[PDB]
Design a protein around this motif. Structure first.
Motif, PDB file in Angstrom:
ATOM      1  N   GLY A 170       0.802  -1.093   0.085  1.00  0.00           N
ATOM      2  CA  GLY A 170      -0.006  -0.101   0.089  1.00  0.00           C
ATOM      3  C   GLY A 170       0.707   1.286  -0.103  1.00  0.00           C
ATOM      4  O   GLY A 170       1.902   1.443   0.535  1.00  0.00           O
ATOM      5  N   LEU A 171       0.090   2.417  -0.428  1.00  0.00           N
ATOM      6  CA  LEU A 171       0.697   3.533  -0.929  1.00  0.00           C
ATOM      7  C   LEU A 171       0.795   4.676  -0.047  1.00  0.00           C
ATOM      8  O   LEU A 171       0.028   4.844   0.909  1.00  0.00           O
ATOM      9  CB  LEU A 171       0.166   3.840  -2.204  1.00  0.00           C
ATOM     10  CG  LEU A 171      -1.261   4.862  -2.014  1.00  0.00           C
ATOM     11  CD1 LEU A 171      -1.607   5.471  -3.574  1.00  0.00           C
ATOM     12  CD2 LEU A 171      -2.243   4.178  -1.609  1.00  0.00           C
ATOM     13  N   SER A 185       6.472   6.769  -3.294  1.00  0.00           N
ATOM     14  CA  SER A 185       7.839   6.663  -3.512  1.00  0.00           C
ATOM     15  C   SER A 185       8.176   5.553  -4.679  1.00  0.00           C
ATOM     16  O   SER A 185       9.074   5.833  -5.506  1.00  0.00           O
ATOM     17  CB  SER A 185       8.711   6.010  -2.205  1.00  0.00           C
ATOM     18  OG  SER A 185       8.678   7.112  -1.082  1.00  0.00           O
ATOM     19  N   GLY A 186       7.289   4.550  -4.751  1.00  0.00           N
ATOM     20  CA  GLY A 186       7.212   3.792  -5.833  1.00  0.00           C
ATOM     21  C   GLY A 186       8.292   2.962  -6.353  1.00  0.00           C
ATOM     22  O   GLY A 186       8.478   1.769  -6.303  1.00  0.00           O
ATOM     23  N   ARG A 244      10.254   1.823  -4.243  1.00  0.00           N
ATOM     24  CA  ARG A 244      10.822   1.287  -3.156  1.00  0.00           C
ATOM     25  C   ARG A 244       9.420   0.457  -2.516  1.00  0.00           C
ATOM     26  O   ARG A 244       9.180   0.490  -1.318  1.00  0.00           O
ATOM     27  CB  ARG A 244      11.251   1.997  -1.797  1.00  0.00           C
ATOM     28  CG  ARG A 244      12.428   2.608  -2.049  1.00  0.00           C
ATOM     29  CD  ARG A 244      12.963   3.597  -1.189  1.00  0.00           C
ATOM     30  NE  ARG A 244      12.069   4.825  -1.207  1.00  0.00           N
ATOM     31  CZ  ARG A 244      12.619   5.710  -1.877  1.00  0.00           C
ATOM     32  NH1 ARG A 244      13.705   5.927  -2.497  1.00  0.00           N
ATOM     33  NH2 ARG A 244      11.699   6.986  -2.061  1.00  0.00           N
ATOM     34  N   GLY A 245       8.820  -0.282  -3.430  1.00  0.00           N
ATOM     35  CA  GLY A 245       7.380  -0.544  -3.235  1.00  0.00           C
ATOM     36  C   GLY A 245       6.470   0.589  -3.565  1.00  0.00           C
ATOM     37  O   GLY A 245       6.274   1.064  -4.385  1.00  0.00           O
ATOM     38  N   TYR A 246       5.345   0.404  -2.514  1.00  0.00           N
ATOM     39  CA  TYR A 246       4.545   1.756  -2.284  1.00  0.00           C
ATOM     40  C   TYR A 246       3.806   2.117  -3.572  1.00  0.00           C
ATOM     41  O   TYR A 246       3.728   3.518  -3.833  1.00  0.00           O
ATOM     42  CB  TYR A 246       5.395   2.932  -1.981  1.00  0.00           C
ATOM     43  CG  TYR A 246       6.229   3.125  -0.744  1.00  0.00           C
ATOM     44  CD1 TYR A 246       5.679   3.601   0.324  1.00  0.00           C
ATOM     45  CD2 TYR A 246       7.387   2.472  -0.498  1.00  0.00           C
ATOM     46  CE1 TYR A 246       6.346   3.809   1.617  1.00  0.00           C
ATOM     47  CE2 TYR A 246       8.256   2.490   0.758  1.00  0.00           C
ATOM     48  CZ  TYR A 246       7.428   3.067   1.472  1.00  0.00           C
ATOM     49  OH  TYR A 246       8.125   3.241   2.940  1.00  0.00           O
ATOM     50  N   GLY A 247       3.107   1.448  -4.241  1.00  0.00           N
ATOM     51  CA  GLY A 247       2.431   1.806  -5.471  1.00  0.00           C
ATOM     52  C   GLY A 247       1.589   0.752  -6.070  1.00  0.00           C
ATOM     53  O   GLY A 247       0.359   1.039  -6.741  1.00  0.00           O
ATOM     54  N   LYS A 248       1.896  -0.775  -6.381  1.00  0.00           N
ATOM     55  CA  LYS A 248       1.523  -1.562  -7.345  1.00  0.00           C
ATOM     56  C   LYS A 248      -0.258  -1.733  -6.863  1.00  0.00           C
ATOM     57  O   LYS A 248      -0.573  -1.839  -5.713  1.00  0.00           O
ATOM     58  CB  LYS A 248       2.030  -2.865  -7.086  1.00  0.00           C
ATOM     59  CG  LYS A 248       3.474  -2.810  -7.526  1.00  0.00           C
ATOM     60  CD  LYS A 248       3.557  -1.788  -8.739  1.00  0.00           C
ATOM     61  CE  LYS A 248       5.252  -1.504  -9.361  1.00  0.00           C
ATOM     62  NZ  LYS A 248       6.029  -0.966  -8.107  1.00  0.00           N
TER      63      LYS A 248
END
Lengths: 121, 150, 207, 295, 216, 217, 121
Positions: F16-17, F184-185, F187-191
């Motif tokens: 989660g974002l 940040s994306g 580093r994870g944070y987006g999908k």
């Protein structure tokens, strides 16, 4: 202390009275104080300069007490902000709010610090 | 020396409304001291000895020299200067010094000297604190937006 | 008998006003529509003709086809009814002190507003100046009792009562379909100065 | 002669021929024509009109009252008593050319010669009214808007029938667009200062100043033209009447003006300026209440 | 006869409003786009003018055959409901949109709401050079309810158009619940919701309960 | 004609974002980068401004033949969908991206979730002297979901551009599955997985049964 | 006890009233209390100062009861933290929460202790 007719000329003098990086001659006479540490201080006051318009003074005196927390705390972290609250008499002016019209005068005083800092280099 | 009063009026307004308010500006320009022009309103009462040599031919030439040799600073930059020139407390001197210095680096880096020879020359006649170099800058910017009105 | 009863009320602005007037100079940034003001005090005024024409066009839709509007507002013809028996006065913005105790900057707010073209979709900004919410103005209304009158005096009272309910259902200003109205009459009392006419039973017709 | 009737307007429209104009003061003829239009609708005019033809009663036009009664400027009475600095003394004769009102505290210094930079009474506005959605619907109405202490004071006979009428002119209003918010005042009967009632003559043969517009009787109009210094001002307009259903025109009485200096002060009239074939009379009050200058 | 009726609906919000006001040169760290407010209480206001301009330009896409170039070129159905300055007839006709004045000031303050306006921070990224340009725009909070009223006058100049003007009005309030009502609304904001509609005659004598089924 | 149709789709989060909020009066020894929140429920919000900001910049690499350098240099297939300010007929522009709110506040309470915003400590490690620099950023949690409204206008200009525009909208939504909704994306944070792509009409008359074949292809 | 208008000046006085290492003259007048023992105390309160915003007070009263556990427990371990909870009246203030707005006042009171501790040496 700061009245309405001088608090910008006070803040103009305080930036000039603040020191500069006299060494490291790569765009010299730059400040030890940086823009992003300065905008963290105004981010505290700018959210009270617009809740002074809406709300009473009788509800804002919890966060006005908190400005003495974090202007001290940001001064303790980096020695450049430590000099700002000494030159610009901020900790003196922050203990002298007492109503809406000085809260807005102090919060315009912080904006005058950011203005001349962006102006002078 | 003579004295004048100029008044802008819209299309289709009656001449009696038109000729009267111009007479209000002439009798206001007689009371500056004696020798003045009164552009558009009773509060632009300039001497002719600083309206032709400063407003109409000096300041308006330099504003027109800037805003034609660029496509970036449009009318929105000019309009926010007028609010800054009109209110003019001590706090708007700082807010103007911040507003020009943001856009000094926001522009493209080829014509940065053009803006810097504009902004340090505009900030010069904002903080003069004699009022004779500032209200002229307001009237010079009225005569520029009136010339570029689409 | 002869009497001049008046209707002292305190008007109240539940939205703004905009009663314009002379348009001097737009001056770019300056107000595109300055509200009419009292040229001594520089407080917003309500001129009496702006009340007098407004409550007669509302009653023109109610009592039309005349005869009962003519005696209450005058007529240039009709020799019976020149200077028709209602003598208004301009409103004076009573609470210039109560607003400052509530905390207010100036008595006249500036409303920004625009106009979007239907095809170009490009705006066109106004600055309609208003007079702020819940200001109260002094409202007084001399109705004249005369020897010719007191046959229809009761029936004029059922019109001026109804001619103030309609201002509470219309706007009394400029640009009223866009707000800028909604005026309310409170403490509407009918005193009698210079006369002998019993104003008791009228005062229960008002409330 | 007797007590002056201070009247506080705060909004008033006074004539001067057009509707775009509004003179400061209103003169004797208007207030008298207000009383007759008042005493008619009280059913009380014949007690007033029997009084209106007597030597007992006086009447005077308005003058500004700013903590003290004021007076007109004498018409040419100050003499040319200095061929030095013509560049500015002609400019002094510009500001001292639209003054027309002097205070009673220093009206004797004006005859003796003093500049008296004029004060301000009621800056005249001009608000542009309309009528919505009609053809040819933009008239324009001027407005005298009085300066927070200035009242107007007709100076008349202290008569109880006169005070009953002028306590009802508080609520009918003087002047122009009354029944639209103009001319409504509040009367306050005061007393005259002692050095003003000292010189409110009517029949004192000396160098005497008028304090109201007066058309003399024809036996006196010959000699009053000789040494007088007067204005003329054209009293005219439409005759208000409830008995026409047609707006006729008065017969254009050319009077003198308040401030006309004179010698051997004359006796005036009540000039029936009714139009031809007209039921009642139009009085158009013109008889002088003077003011001695040196006495 | 002459009559005026009144639409007391209740504008809720979802994805809260931003009806811009004084976009003048604000302070430095302050709000870059403040909402329009009250000088007395400093509360949010939906003005009646932003209701009326949004309700035309949504009904202009529905109730116009020819595409109008200007507001003076509407149909006979819009120019009499929303007023028209070029018709001899349709000047000053059929609708008074009053302002909205923040009904649940106490209900929001019973909950965790500190301020009646949220300030969301927000930026934009340049497409080449990926530089951010931030903005702080003010925004009315999500669960506000605004008092909304109209005045529909019946001036005895139609005598049969009454029952089909509300078919336009109820359609106009269905389109504001689908369009955004004011401000930067294609990026989220606005999204009003009209609740508790009730037509009640205030002056005159017109049967509204036979009409109140059109409002349901 | 005039019709308005609606893409009632549903964002599902995976890792989660974060979507930033200033929150200056946040704390000292706690969250210094808060997620934006609904100020009455204090729940994580996906605003429409960061949904619309991706889908111009993600579709700038697909539907611009020439590189933009600005908005209102896009190629009239993004302009008629999103909008310009220096074009004439494409200023208001066929997409109202309504905000998305936290839908399954009950499913997260059904599972073992204390707070709807987890806080992660992140520690910029200096690569000489190895000295730390912690931050506490706040993000929505992993299996949150969001009601994603999207409204499409059909004026008297969409002759056959309705289908051409929906090849674009299911080119920007299936590309946000390959990108990260801001934060940040890298580093994870987006999908995210856009569940339940389902068009419907809310005003007008337009047949949508030929539309629910490429949304769910 | 601490009100809104004094709890920072209370915490400013409590750091000054706290003792210093009067011996060991190597950067002297330093505290026996260390930064890392102080930030372990604020790490308890900082995770409630931000769940006071989100959650009710009716769910936080389990951990507010736990702050009396660990402010006692950290005081029992090292004698320097033992002096902090005596000088700064923390155990008195912690038994006086009762609502959200004092929980946030106490959690800003702990931040004022950390601020002046970083400030004064």
């Amino acid at each position: 202390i700061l009245t309405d007719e001088n608090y910008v000329d006070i803040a103009e003098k305080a930036i000039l009275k603040l020191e500069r990086n006299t060494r490291n001659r790569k765009n010299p006479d730059a400040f030890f104080l940086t823009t992003s540490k300065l905008r963290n201080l105004l981010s505290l006051t700018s959210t009270l300069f617009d809740e002074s318009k809406v709300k009473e003074y009788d509800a804002l005196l919890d966060r006005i007490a908190y400005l003495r927390v974090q202007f001290v705390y940001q001064a303790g972290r980096e020695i450049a902000v430590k000099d700002l609250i000494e030159k610009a008499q901020i900790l003196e002016a922050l203990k002298e709010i007492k109503d809406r019209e000085t809260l807005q005068r102090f919060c315009r005083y912080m904006e005058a610090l950011v203005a001349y800092f962006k102006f002078y280099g | 020396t003579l004295s004048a009063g100029i008044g802008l009026f819209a299309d289709k307004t009656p001449i009696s409304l038109m000729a009267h308010q111009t007479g209000e500006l002439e009798e206001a320009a007689k009371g500056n001291e004696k020798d003045s022009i009164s552009l558009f309103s009773s509060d632009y009462t300039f001497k002719f000895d600083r309206f032709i040599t400063n407003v109409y031919d000096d300041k308006l030439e330099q504003i027109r020299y800037f805003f034609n040799h660029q496509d970036e600073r449009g009318k929105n930059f000019i309009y926010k200067l007028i609010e800054l020139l009109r209110n003019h407390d001590r706090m708007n001197m700082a807010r103007l010094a911040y507003y020009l210095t943001r856009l000094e680096e926001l522009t493209r880096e080829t014509d940065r000297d053009k803006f810097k020879t504009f902004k340090n020359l505009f900030y010069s006649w904002y903080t003069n604190k004699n009022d004779k170099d500032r209200k002229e800058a307001e009237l010079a910017l009225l005569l520029y937006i009136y010339e570029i009105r689409k | 008998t002869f009497a001049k009863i008046k209707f002292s009320a305190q008007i109240r602005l539940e939205t703004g006003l905009h009663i314009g007037g002379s348009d001097a100079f737009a001056a770019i940034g300056a107000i595109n529509s300055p509200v009419i003001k009292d040229p001594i005090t520089n407080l917003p005024i309500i001129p009496g003709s702006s009340l007098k024409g407004k409550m007669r066009t509302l009653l023109a839709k109610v009592y039309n086809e005349s005869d009962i509007l003519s005696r209450l507002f005058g007529n240039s013809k009709d020799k019976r009814f020149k200077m028709g028996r209602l003598i208004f006065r301009d409103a004076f913005l009573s609470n210039a002190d109560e607003l400052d105790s509530l905390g207010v900057r100036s008595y006249t707010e500036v409303k920004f507003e625009n106009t979007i073209d239907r095809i170009t979709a490009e705006a066109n900004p106004r600055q309609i100046e208003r007079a702020i919410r819940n200001s109260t103005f002094d409202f007084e209304l001399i109705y004249e009792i005369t020897d010719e009158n007191e046959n229809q005096v009761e029936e004029d009272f059922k019109v001026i009562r109804d001619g103030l309910k309609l201002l509470e259902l219309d706007y009394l200003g400029g640009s009223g379909s866009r707000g800028y109205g909604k005026v309310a009459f409170e403490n509407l009392k009918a005193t009698t100065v210079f006369g002998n006419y019993d104003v008791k039973t009228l005062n229960e017709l008002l409330t | 002669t007797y007590k002056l009737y201070i009247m506080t307007f705060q909004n008033a429209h006074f004539g001067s021929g057009t509707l775009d104009s509004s003179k400061l003061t209103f003169s004797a003829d208007r207030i008298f024509s207000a009383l007759v239009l008042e005493a008619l609708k009280m059913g009380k005019l014949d007690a007033f009109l029997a009084e209106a033809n007597q030597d007992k009663f006086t009447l005077t036009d308005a003058f500004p009252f700013q903590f003290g009664p004021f007076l007109p400027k004498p018409i040419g009475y100050p003499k040319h008593d200095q061929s030095v600095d013509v560049k500015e003394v002609r400019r002094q004769a510009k500001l001292s050319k639209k003054l027309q009102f002097l205070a009673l505290e220093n009206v004797d210094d004006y005859l003796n010669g003093e500049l008296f930079e004029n004060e301000e009474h009621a800056v005249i506005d001009t608000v542009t009214k309309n009528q919505p959605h009609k053809d040819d619907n933009l008239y324009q109405v001027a407005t005298t808007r009085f300066s927070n202490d200035t009242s107007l004071y007709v100076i008349a006979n202290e008569s109880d029938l006169l005070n009953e009428l002028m306590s009802s002119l508080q609520y009918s209003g003087l002047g122009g667009k009354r029944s639209s918010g103009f001319g409504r005042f509040e009367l306050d009967i005061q007393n005259i200062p002692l050095e003003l009632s000292d010189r409110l003559t009517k029949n004192h043969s000396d160098k005497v100043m008028s304090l109201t517009t007066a058309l003399p009787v024809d036996a006196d109009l010959e000699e009053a033209m000789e040494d007088g210094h007067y204005l003329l001002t054209k009293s005219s307009g439409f005759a208000f009447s409830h008995a026409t259903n047609e707006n006729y025109r008065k017969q254009d009485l050319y009077k003198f003006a308040s401030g006309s200096t004179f010698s051997k002060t004359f006796e005036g009239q009540i000039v029936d300026v009714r139009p031809l074939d007209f039921p009642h009379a139009v009085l158009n009050y013109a008889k002088p209440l003077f003011f001695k200058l040196e006495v």
